[PDB]
């Protein structure tokens, strides 16, 4: 057959062998995922992500593959810090003074910096978890993971939030992505129990690296003195790795950083996004459209420095597999989405699409179904398998741009947040692993929450009401403008088995929110 | 040392520490008495469990080993009589106001035998003091007896907390506390209204101060310069 457009893959078995190949050990995972999640339309049984489940499936990210601390850091490169008082902390990082009026169902509150609010009882069911107020622009969030075989309490878990001293203004001289900008910004590190949802701000780290994004914990940076190690790109144009050294106490501490354990930098170019290809090497993008793989052990010179885009590379993502090459995907302001193999870019570069030039394009990898998940830079969520770039399947349509996307290593549930304050959940596996014919009716999505705001009343008005949106396949792109603070800036599931039903999301005013899906 | 069991010696000694410029030590003297009271209820109900496994509470449980248990746990009885002045001692401190509010929560909840309802000191809102209590998701999980117990703190302590919330600039909770002053008999609270209106004046809440002072213009004891001077200033 001349199999050259998605409509040629009419037979369900033909689709699966064309999109996923014939490696017997690879096909097992798809059968397990299908049976373990076909009935999981909007939620999944806790029993399916547990380490003993008959349907248990788990693919570790490449950074977890071997111990990295002695290679990436070690005693030769410990992070340099000093402790500080609350008076000087508040002198630089002017987090929001005036309280915000939240409404959550029937409850009002005026909520100050740090005011945890458990969900009040709501008419549509047993909501569990909390709203918060982090007090400035949440630019990124990152859940840590701990191996459940360790002596650490299986229900304790950690989360980090990167917070700007800048506020509800969306255009500022200080959030510029084009040029290098060092300024004071911070990381709030939270310890919480997945069992009782009780949470404490353990450490606050202050740094002059400017705003922080693409924030991720290195799951191989294990040492008895560390919580973990926290990795990010910063507005000073460098990649900074810093040690989250553990306290002898549950009491809060404020810290300032003089030198991070490992700084990746390059002459006359600013690094813009990054991802791990192994426990000790990272792919990264630059302002000038270049791509490079740095060695965390030998950070002086990159392994390669090749041009791949015409302008600012926005997001880079790794599609790891136990059966195929570690391909990398990239999108830029030039709108191209390219997939390539770092062994040789020039012989392997492939195009999935060209978008309208859009200044925030979330891209993530769903390792349970070997598919990239992306916003089209406008208002649709789409899936593309790494080995069949033409097989683009649209997942959901929204009236305003998709601004943040999250996915986990234990389940195929995708979370997407639009700049209208809507948060939606959908099962990507139901689209990828099944036939094309009845796609306009067999795949659906659910709104888990919606923020809203009043210009005159000045409230943030979180709506618990669930809404079902069916898949409009032939749909138009849309762009409804909405209140500056209500856009969703990040969204991520906890990926441990104990925490696997827990997720976190943030608006841009500061209203970080977590729920345990039970 | 000669008598650790007299409330007068404690009150006067605590007052001398306030004039000694150690209001902190005055609260430290109180904390040790409150702790002894908390420990006594843990001991009294543990002794009930021992009697089962074999003061009006003595008449309720005469099978307990009361001689040894009470000889070991003899103490000054802590109650609202102590807590109103302790709340005023935090208002006298004018520092660590949030910790003062938390201290008053711990004490007020223990007086009602509801101390085991631990979530009320973790949450930021004063929900347990109002019909708001039904709205928090942890309340529906309580035992029927725990739901039947009293949540009704004295109007005095409610005003002391309203003043402390206002000092922390938590104006919404200050009004939530002061609302009961408009439900109770004015004849028994007009002095608290003077303190609330003057404290609102200190907080630059001049419109609210006038509103809180308005009832005082109805009695000859309160139709005075202490009200006319703030009224005129707030209007200026």
XYZ file of C-alpha atoms in Angstrom:
754
model
C 0.000 0.000 0.000
C 1.055 3.686 -0.565
C 0.809 4.535 3.198
C 1.516 8.337 2.956
C -1.276 10.246 4.806
C -3.112 9.320 8.072
C -6.295 8.269 6.148
C -4.339 5.385 4.485
C -3.972 3.667 7.966
C -7.713 2.689 7.953
C -7.297 -0.738 9.690
C -6.705 -0.601 13.479
C -3.953 -3.300 13.377
C -2.307 -1.507 10.412
C -2.281 1.769 12.417
C -0.570 0.133 15.422
C 2.158 -1.660 13.401
C 2.735 1.508 11.255
C 2.920 3.914 14.230
C 4.588 1.532 16.787
C 6.535 -1.157 14.825
C 6.809 -4.905 15.606
C 9.304 -5.165 18.534
C 7.434 -7.771 20.656
C 8.646 -6.353 23.989
C 7.451 -2.814 22.946
C 3.974 -4.005 21.943
C 3.422 -5.534 25.451
C 3.365 -2.057 27.054
C 0.662 -0.889 24.597
C -1.536 -3.909 25.424
C -1.019 -3.261 29.182
C -1.784 0.489 28.837
C -4.900 -0.239 26.709
C -6.382 -2.748 29.172
C -5.274 -0.767 32.279
C -6.660 2.617 31.028
C -9.378 2.108 28.275
C -12.145 2.667 30.915
C -10.169 5.578 32.517
C -12.010 8.375 30.599
C -11.334 11.181 33.160
C -9.816 9.285 36.163
C -7.925 5.958 36.703
C -7.942 3.300 39.492
C -5.191 3.877 42.141
C -4.578 0.087 41.966
C -3.290 0.431 38.337
C -0.256 2.746 39.026
C 0.850 0.772 42.135
C 4.215 -1.128 41.735
C 2.519 -4.570 42.020
C -0.443 -4.008 39.644
C -1.204 -6.629 36.897
C -1.312 -3.544 34.571
C 1.740 -1.735 36.097
C 3.764 0.216 33.506
C 6.581 2.705 34.265
C 9.295 4.227 32.035
C 11.999 6.189 33.952
C 13.375 9.431 32.389
C 16.966 9.210 31.016
C 18.384 11.305 33.940
C 17.375 8.517 36.422
C 19.169 5.701 34.452
C 22.393 5.672 36.643
C 23.763 7.608 39.699
C 24.759 11.155 38.590
C 25.819 13.069 41.782
C 29.536 12.070 41.711
C 29.764 13.004 37.951
C 27.551 16.167 37.819
C 28.543 17.562 41.288
C 30.461 15.610 44.019
C 32.349 17.139 46.995
C 34.525 19.179 44.526
C 31.425 21.245 43.465
C 29.120 21.729 46.557
C 26.666 24.693 46.161
C 27.694 27.932 47.979
C 24.951 29.458 50.200
C 24.472 31.648 53.303
C 21.373 31.931 55.528
C 19.424 35.226 55.810
C 16.782 37.050 57.919
C 13.172 37.825 56.831
C 13.801 41.625 56.827
C 16.421 41.575 54.016
C 14.438 38.849 52.146
C 11.421 41.219 51.972
C 13.712 44.185 51.034
C 14.573 42.627 47.616
C 11.739 40.159 46.876
C 8.733 42.482 47.328
C 6.098 39.665 47.190
C 2.498 40.960 47.105
C 1.451 43.157 50.040
C -2.357 43.472 49.539
C -4.470 40.331 50.146
C -6.430 38.690 47.293
C -10.190 38.003 47.585
C -10.666 34.324 46.692
C -14.077 32.719 46.283
C -14.314 28.886 46.325
C -17.942 27.782 46.037
C -19.732 29.587 48.924
C -16.537 30.645 50.857
C -14.901 34.064 50.592
C -11.447 34.733 51.999
C -8.871 37.519 51.948
C -5.731 35.435 51.418
C -2.252 36.726 52.361
C 1.211 35.472 51.285
C 1.293 31.833 52.512
C -2.399 31.293 53.427
C -3.160 27.580 52.724
C -6.912 26.941 52.157
C -8.305 23.397 52.167
C -11.152 22.953 49.620
C -14.503 23.759 51.289
C -17.260 21.174 50.639
C -18.620 21.645 47.094
C -21.929 20.510 45.570
C -20.282 18.360 42.824
C -18.443 16.033 45.325
C -15.654 15.263 47.819
C -12.919 17.730 46.655
C -9.539 16.986 48.436
C -6.414 19.220 48.530
C -5.722 22.972 48.860
C -5.511 26.388 47.227
C -2.512 28.545 48.252
C -1.029 32.009 47.608
C 2.686 32.088 46.695
C 2.630 35.923 46.436
C 4.084 36.669 42.929
C 4.180 35.345 39.323
C 4.599 31.554 39.398
C 6.872 30.959 36.355
C 7.340 27.195 36.917
C 6.560 24.282 39.293
C 8.464 21.000 39.744
C 7.595 17.855 41.715
C 10.498 15.740 43.057
C 10.276 11.915 43.261
C 11.737 9.497 45.864
C 12.110 5.723 45.257
C 9.464 3.992 47.479
C 12.017 1.252 48.433
C 14.008 3.901 50.490
C 13.781 4.393 54.316
C 12.058 7.822 53.783
C 8.281 7.802 54.586
C 6.504 6.705 51.330
C 3.817 9.421 51.803
C 6.282 12.392 52.136
C 6.914 14.225 48.784
C 8.490 17.548 47.659
C 7.513 20.390 45.299
C 9.307 23.582 44.147
C 7.848 26.857 42.807
C 9.766 29.559 40.940
C 8.339 32.957 41.780
C 8.894 36.372 40.260
C 8.915 39.558 42.315
C 6.877 40.927 39.329
C 3.085 40.837 39.294
C -0.175 40.822 37.248
C 1.261 43.137 34.530
C 1.908 40.878 31.465
C 4.324 43.331 29.724
C 7.428 44.341 31.746
C 11.056 45.407 31.007
C 12.099 42.697 33.481
C 10.448 39.479 31.966
C 12.202 39.940 28.546
C 13.209 36.632 26.902
C 15.434 38.105 24.153
C 18.280 39.737 26.157
C 20.325 38.692 29.240
C 18.848 39.930 32.572
C 20.160 39.032 36.098
C 17.715 40.012 38.928
C 16.357 38.771 42.288
C 13.822 35.892 41.989
C 13.192 32.881 44.275
C 12.427 29.214 44.810
C 10.003 28.116 47.531
C 10.537 24.417 48.383
C 7.543 22.654 49.950
C 7.360 19.386 51.883
C 3.972 17.669 51.920
C 2.304 14.394 52.886
C 0.290 12.630 50.110
C -1.657 10.941 52.982
C -2.869 14.047 54.952
C -2.139 16.858 52.384
C -0.393 18.787 55.234
C 2.323 21.084 53.776
C 5.186 23.286 55.063
C 7.448 25.800 53.297
C 10.855 24.226 54.173
C 13.357 26.462 52.333
C 13.283 29.706 50.395
C 16.246 30.194 48.035
C 17.114 33.668 46.745
C 19.260 34.156 43.634
C 20.146 36.942 41.181
C 19.881 34.648 38.063
C 16.599 36.357 36.989
C 13.397 34.407 36.285
C 13.477 30.602 36.160
C 11.760 28.030 33.889
C 12.114 24.489 32.448
C 12.634 23.601 36.144
C 13.169 19.869 36.847
C 14.655 17.687 39.628
C 17.567 15.429 38.613
C 16.282 11.942 39.686
C 19.879 10.492 39.699
C 21.563 13.179 41.907
C 21.318 10.924 45.039
C 23.374 11.538 48.198
C 22.381 11.135 51.947
C 22.878 14.928 52.603
C 20.494 16.042 49.749
C 16.728 16.243 49.280
C 17.777 16.233 45.588
C 19.248 18.630 42.998
C 17.239 21.270 41.151
C 17.993 22.179 37.530
C 16.819 25.140 35.460
C 17.390 27.638 32.634
C 17.548 31.219 33.888
C 17.106 34.687 32.410
C 20.886 35.302 32.798
C 21.139 32.870 29.804
C 22.853 30.008 31.702
C 21.679 26.577 32.956
C 22.097 26.353 36.744
C 22.155 23.187 38.857
C 21.943 23.672 42.657
C 22.036 21.289 45.668
C 18.914 21.095 47.849
C 20.848 20.285 51.057
C 18.532 18.866 53.741
C 17.751 20.617 57.091
C 18.181 19.025 60.554
C 14.691 20.540 61.324
C 11.171 21.082 59.868
C 11.612 24.857 60.668
C 11.714 27.291 57.702
C 15.034 28.773 56.426
C 15.832 31.624 54.034
C 19.003 31.214 51.853
C 20.943 33.237 49.268
C 23.127 31.587 46.563
C 26.655 32.762 45.587
C 27.637 29.905 43.212
C 25.475 26.995 41.865
C 27.125 23.535 41.654
C 27.221 23.514 37.828
C 26.703 26.406 35.371
C 26.450 25.701 31.645
C 27.094 28.807 29.504
C 28.314 29.740 26.008
C 29.905 32.814 24.420
C 27.554 35.579 23.092
C 24.425 33.306 23.243
C 21.659 32.746 25.811
C 20.404 29.230 26.582
C 16.568 29.102 26.343
C 15.416 25.529 27.171
C 16.976 22.125 28.019
C 16.396 18.390 28.555
C 18.386 15.317 29.750
C 19.640 12.713 27.224
C 21.448 10.676 29.922
C 22.247 11.096 33.663
C 25.223 13.344 32.636
C 24.396 15.106 29.298
C 21.809 17.730 28.313
C 20.458 19.012 24.987
C 19.796 22.758 25.021
C 18.616 25.552 22.721
C 19.799 29.136 22.221
C 18.497 32.666 21.272
C 20.175 32.346 17.839
C 18.298 29.099 16.906
C 21.281 26.812 17.639
C 21.147 23.462 19.496
C 23.951 21.912 21.626
C 24.563 18.865 23.837
C 26.583 19.790 26.957
C 28.457 17.318 29.144
C 27.750 17.948 32.832
C 31.182 16.421 33.682
C 33.036 18.499 31.015
C 30.985 21.788 30.855
C 33.832 23.847 29.258
C 32.907 22.977 25.603
C 29.697 21.501 24.050
C 29.712 18.154 22.212
C 28.178 19.949 19.162
C 26.844 23.444 18.295
C 24.655 23.300 15.149
C 21.986 25.652 13.751
C 18.480 24.123 13.582
C 16.152 27.178 13.733
C 15.913 30.687 12.290
C 15.040 32.322 15.649
C 14.419 31.742 19.405
C 14.016 28.021 20.249
C 11.190 27.906 22.840
C 11.033 24.302 24.002
C 13.138 21.145 23.529
C 11.952 17.642 24.559
C 13.433 14.097 24.631
C 11.455 11.041 23.448
C 13.267 8.233 25.272
C 12.535 4.557 24.476
C 13.792 1.088 25.443
C 13.653 0.137 21.691
C 14.497 3.248 19.547
C 17.019 6.103 19.400
C 16.671 9.055 21.835
C 15.114 11.555 19.401
C 14.784 15.223 20.322
C 12.053 17.656 19.310
C 12.285 21.431 19.078
C 9.926 24.342 18.370
C 10.795 28.002 17.820
C 9.276 31.426 17.059
C 9.811 30.538 13.335
C 6.950 28.073 13.992
C 8.672 24.867 12.805
C 8.405 21.694 14.874
C 11.458 19.496 14.110
C 12.287 15.971 15.374
C 15.946 14.822 15.046
C 18.533 12.381 16.422
C 21.541 13.987 18.237
C 23.926 11.370 16.669
C 23.658 13.383 13.378
C 21.154 16.259 12.957
C 21.870 16.878 9.248
C 21.124 13.255 8.161
C 18.005 12.816 10.409
C 16.089 16.172 10.758
C 12.319 15.770 10.111
C 9.344 18.246 10.214
C 5.996 17.601 11.983
C 4.357 21.011 11.228
C 4.721 24.755 10.838
C 2.653 26.846 13.296
C 1.845 30.549 13.264
C 4.718 32.249 15.131
C 3.599 32.025 18.793
C 5.474 33.292 21.841
C 4.582 30.413 24.191
C 4.361 26.811 22.826
C 4.136 24.042 25.466
C 5.592 20.670 24.313
C 5.879 17.521 26.502
C 6.607 13.781 26.071
C 3.967 11.167 27.095
C 6.260 8.127 27.665
C 3.347 5.666 28.146
C 2.330 5.963 24.427
C 5.666 7.135 22.852
C 3.993 10.384 21.694
C 4.890 14.027 21.923
C 2.009 16.230 23.101
C 1.940 19.879 21.980
C -0.058 23.076 21.648
C -0.300 24.272 18.035
C 0.724 27.752 19.325
C -2.932 28.760 18.864
C -5.770 26.781 20.495
C -5.557 22.989 19.890
C -3.770 20.150 21.722
C -2.200 17.500 19.391
C -0.291 14.232 19.616
C 2.546 13.037 17.302
C 4.310 9.652 17.612
C 8.118 9.995 17.395
C 8.343 7.388 14.525
C 5.367 8.577 12.395
C 5.534 12.386 12.199
C 2.617 12.598 9.698
C 0.268 10.851 12.217
C -0.779 14.083 13.987
C -3.971 13.430 16.019
C -5.783 16.437 17.574
C -6.818 15.730 21.226
C -8.843 18.847 22.357
C -9.949 22.352 21.178
C -10.103 25.443 23.514
C -11.458 29.019 23.005
C -8.119 30.540 24.205
C -4.469 29.458 23.776
C -3.112 26.332 25.536
C -0.358 27.762 27.758
C 0.821 24.847 29.943
C 0.670 21.027 29.520
C 1.619 18.242 31.973
C 1.963 14.459 31.712
C 3.327 11.584 33.856
C 5.515 8.453 33.543
C 2.925 6.163 35.279
C -0.298 7.029 33.350
C -1.414 8.531 29.973
C -3.574 11.318 31.513
C -2.779 14.718 29.954
C -3.544 17.995 31.737
C -3.826 21.185 29.676
C -4.393 24.757 30.860
C -5.714 27.570 28.652
C -5.225 31.314 29.180
C -9.029 31.611 29.807
C -8.290 29.990 33.243
C -9.780 26.598 32.205
C -7.996 23.365 33.214
C -8.866 20.215 31.204
C -8.080 16.495 31.594
C -8.099 13.937 28.760
C -6.895 10.392 28.099
C -4.320 10.547 25.284
C -4.022 6.714 25.076
C -7.683 6.429 23.959
C -6.727 8.519 20.852
C -3.307 6.953 20.077
C -4.019 3.199 20.597
C -7.454 2.995 18.810
C -9.155 3.382 15.380
C -9.573 6.637 13.363
C -13.221 6.166 12.190
C -15.283 7.272 15.244
C -12.747 9.800 16.659
C -15.297 12.702 16.598
C -17.447 10.907 19.266
C -15.368 8.188 21.087
C -12.798 10.687 22.576
C -13.930 13.429 25.072
C -12.468 15.820 27.705
C -13.476 17.175 31.153
C -12.902 20.605 32.735
C -11.540 20.001 36.275
C -11.540 23.701 37.257
C -11.963 27.260 35.956
C -10.600 30.529 37.307
C -12.554 33.744 36.628
C -12.214 37.407 37.624
C -14.355 40.589 37.933
C -12.872 43.970 36.916
C -15.100 45.779 39.497
C -15.372 43.171 42.339
C -11.610 42.214 42.105
C -12.188 38.544 43.193
C -10.661 35.352 41.847
C -13.662 33.055 41.562
C -12.593 29.367 41.208
C -15.472 27.297 39.815
C -15.599 23.617 40.790
C -18.265 22.730 38.180
C -17.323 19.952 35.761
C -18.040 20.466 31.995
C -17.651 17.857 29.212
C -16.176 19.041 25.871
C -16.434 16.550 22.924
C -13.741 16.533 20.199
C -14.448 19.140 17.460
C -12.043 17.765 14.755
C -12.575 20.354 11.937
C -12.492 23.297 14.427
C -11.201 26.863 13.887
C -8.385 28.340 16.005
C -9.705 30.961 18.513
C -8.140 33.718 20.673
C -10.522 35.171 23.364
C -8.631 37.756 25.535
C -9.060 37.243 29.354
C -7.923 38.694 32.737
C -4.124 38.847 33.124
C -3.914 36.938 36.416
C -6.213 34.029 35.416
C -3.942 32.450 32.765
C -2.435 29.040 33.770
C 1.420 29.221 33.965
C 2.273 25.575 34.825
C 0.526 22.214 35.483
C 2.184 18.901 36.558
C 1.175 15.550 38.063
C 3.230 14.045 40.882
C 4.715 10.877 39.316
C 5.451 8.604 42.343
C 3.023 5.663 42.839
C 1.771 7.048 46.202
C 1.435 10.607 44.805
C 0.449 9.558 41.222
C -3.202 10.752 41.579
C -2.017 14.206 42.797
C -1.526 17.253 40.565
C -0.554 20.893 40.923
C -1.386 23.943 38.797
C -0.901 27.729 38.987
C -2.424 30.890 37.629
C -0.284 33.990 37.005
C -1.544 36.035 39.988
C -0.106 33.405 42.404
C -2.961 31.012 43.301
C -1.131 27.664 43.228
C -3.661 24.811 43.688
C -3.274 21.055 44.405
C -5.797 18.193 44.363
C -5.648 14.488 45.178
C -7.947 12.733 42.662
C -9.876 10.394 45.042
C 7.127 27.990 96.072
C 5.223 27.870 99.428
C 1.893 27.578 97.495
C 1.961 26.871 93.694
C -1.883 26.555 93.857
C -3.113 30.208 94.321
C -4.393 32.290 91.354
C -3.862 35.653 93.170
C -0.073 35.122 93.700
C 0.196 34.199 89.973
C -1.813 37.278 88.763
C 0.177 39.781 90.854
C 3.569 38.156 90.007
C 2.662 38.139 86.270
C 1.672 41.858 86.567
C 5.032 42.692 88.231
C 6.878 41.001 85.292
C 4.861 43.297 82.903
C 6.075 46.418 84.778
C 9.593 44.769 84.911
C 9.533 45.156 81.045
C 9.217 41.345 80.555
C 5.681 40.884 79.184
C 7.213 37.817 77.421
C 8.111 36.296 80.836
C 4.561 37.146 82.042
C 3.216 34.942 79.197
C 5.953 32.316 80.007
C 4.569 32.087 83.589
C 1.086 31.514 82.054
C 2.216 28.860 79.481
C 3.437 26.547 82.302
C -0.023 26.722 84.025
C -1.887 26.074 80.749
C 0.414 23.090 79.986
C -0.261 21.641 83.490
C -4.025 21.917 82.808
C -3.721 20.147 79.389
C -1.624 17.367 81.000
C -4.259 16.942 83.775
C -7.049 16.075 81.232
C -4.741 13.574 79.465
C -4.102 11.983 82.908
C -7.807 12.100 84.065
C -9.147 10.302 80.916
C -6.171 7.858 80.886
C -7.139 7.036 84.520
C -10.777 6.532 83.302
C -9.416 4.055 80.702
C -7.503 2.236 83.515
C -10.714 2.095 85.637
C -12.674 0.759 82.585
C -9.919 -1.819 81.722
C -9.751 -3.115 85.377
C -14.667 18.085 90.578
C -17.900 17.034 88.757
C -15.761 14.547 86.728
C -15.114 12.664 90.053
C -18.878 12.279 90.564
C -19.107 11.090 86.910
C -16.273 8.486 87.419
C -16.012 7.373 91.167
C -14.236 4.054 90.210
C -10.924 5.887 89.324
C -7.864 5.899 91.718
C -8.597 9.581 92.633
C -6.298 9.838 95.703
C -2.974 9.169 93.864
C -4.053 10.623 90.460
C -5.231 13.962 91.925
C -2.340 14.161 94.469
C 0.095 13.771 91.493
C -1.818 16.193 89.177
C -2.897 19.025 91.574
C -3.019 22.391 89.648
C -4.549 25.920 89.234
C -7.802 25.509 87.133
C -7.370 27.255 83.729
C -10.567 28.667 82.097
C -12.025 31.800 80.312
C -11.430 33.710 83.605
C -7.682 33.210 82.847
C -7.897 33.419 79.021
C -9.572 36.897 78.798
C -6.646 38.445 80.747
C -4.100 36.265 78.806
C -5.586 37.614 75.534
C -5.219 41.142 76.998
C -1.589 40.206 77.924
C -0.924 39.525 74.193
C -2.586 42.901 73.379
C -0.168 44.411 76.018
C 2.809 42.632 74.307
C 2.035 44.217 70.871
C 4.609 41.750 69.280
C 4.205 38.129 67.934
C 0.463 38.879 67.397
C -0.043 35.831 65.069
C 1.537 33.524 67.713
C -0.746 35.263 70.278
C -3.806 34.421 68.088
C -2.536 30.780 67.818
C -1.995 30.667 71.622
C -5.576 31.939 72.196
C -6.908 29.260 69.715
C -5.095 26.433 71.603
C -6.480 27.690 74.953
C -10.083 28.385 73.758
C -10.357 24.935 72.050
C -9.063 23.121 75.175
C -11.660 24.860 77.441
C -14.440 23.304 75.266
C -12.824 19.749 75.459
C -12.395 19.884 71.582
C -8.533 20.133 71.569
C -8.249 16.831 69.555
C -9.928 18.658 66.560
C -6.314 19.567 65.528
C -7.052 20.963 62.023
C -8.522 24.207 63.492
C -4.986 25.462 64.428
C -3.524 24.584 60.958
C -6.230 26.461 58.916
C -5.890 30.319 58.659
C -9.645 31.194 59.013
C -11.683 31.593 62.271
C -14.295 29.139 60.881
C -14.890 27.191 64.168
C -16.304 30.348 65.842
C -19.122 30.774 63.212
C -21.553 28.826 60.927
C -18.470 28.821 58.597
C -17.484 25.598 60.538
C -19.821 23.515 58.269
C -17.927 24.635 55.080
C -14.434 23.163 55.782
C -14.202 19.563 54.406
C -12.624 18.121 57.631
C -15.704 18.997 59.813
C -18.109 16.506 58.137
C -15.714 13.640 59.186
C -16.079 14.415 62.963
C -17.931 12.090 65.407
C -21.588 13.025 66.263
C -20.454 13.862 69.858
C -17.617 16.114 68.488
C -20.246 17.930 66.332
C -22.607 18.269 69.370
C -19.938 19.892 71.686
C -19.953 23.677 72.280
C -17.999 25.972 69.852
C -19.408 29.122 71.544
C -16.510 31.215 73.018
C -17.273 34.178 75.403
C -17.997 37.608 73.799
C -15.012 39.044 75.771
C -12.433 36.680 74.159
C -14.122 37.211 70.736
C -13.537 41.002 71.074
C -9.920 40.460 72.311
C -9.261 38.360 69.169
C -11.063 40.990 66.987
C -8.639 43.602 68.384
C -5.619 41.290 67.813
C -6.748 40.434 64.204
C -7.133 44.208 63.579
C -3.555 44.783 64.927
C -2.390 42.147 62.318
C -4.440 44.235 59.742
C -6.722 41.158 59.107
C -9.765 43.497 58.938
C -12.243 40.882 57.536
C -11.700 38.566 60.528
C -11.761 41.613 62.870
C -15.323 42.438 61.648
C -16.262 38.708 61.772
C -15.267 38.797 65.483
C -16.897 42.179 66.266
C -20.277 41.191 64.619
C -21.364 39.453 67.875
C -21.133 42.813 69.757
C -24.207 43.864 67.669
C -26.110 40.633 68.600
C -25.469 40.759 72.405
C -27.014 43.270 74.915
C -25.255 46.683 74.498
C -25.622 47.405 78.274
C -23.008 44.638 78.983
C -20.509 45.596 76.164
C -20.476 49.450 75.644
C -16.952 49.586 77.229
C -15.711 46.962 74.717
C -17.325 49.125 71.965
C -15.220 52.128 73.155
C -12.054 49.954 72.933
C -13.120 48.594 69.488
C -13.917 52.093 68.096
C -10.651 53.585 69.526
C -8.632 50.589 68.207
C -10.345 51.088 64.768
C -9.263 54.775 65.060
C -5.640 53.596 65.783
C -5.928 51.346 62.677
C -6.927 54.464 60.532
C -10.414 52.792 60.058
C -12.121 56.142 60.861
C -15.496 55.330 59.150
C -15.747 52.046 61.106
C -14.662 53.871 64.305
C -17.635 56.327 63.910
C -19.990 53.375 63.288
C -18.682 51.537 66.415
C -18.888 54.785 68.503
C -22.499 55.551 67.294
C -24.212 53.332 70.004
C -22.378 55.220 72.844
C -24.384 58.412 72.004
C -27.493 56.653 73.535
C -26.282 56.559 77.231
C -25.286 59.375 79.677
C -22.272 57.229 80.790
C -20.975 57.302 77.148
C -22.273 60.724 75.805
C -18.749 61.983 76.750
C -15.577 63.692 75.365
C -13.950 60.223 74.985
C -16.524 59.760 72.131
C -17.044 63.394 70.951
C -13.284 64.013 70.320
C -12.816 60.851 68.106
C -16.184 61.532 66.328
C -15.090 65.085 65.451
C -11.550 63.968 64.368
C -12.814 61.063 62.212
C -15.319 63.487 60.584
C -12.436 66.023 59.998
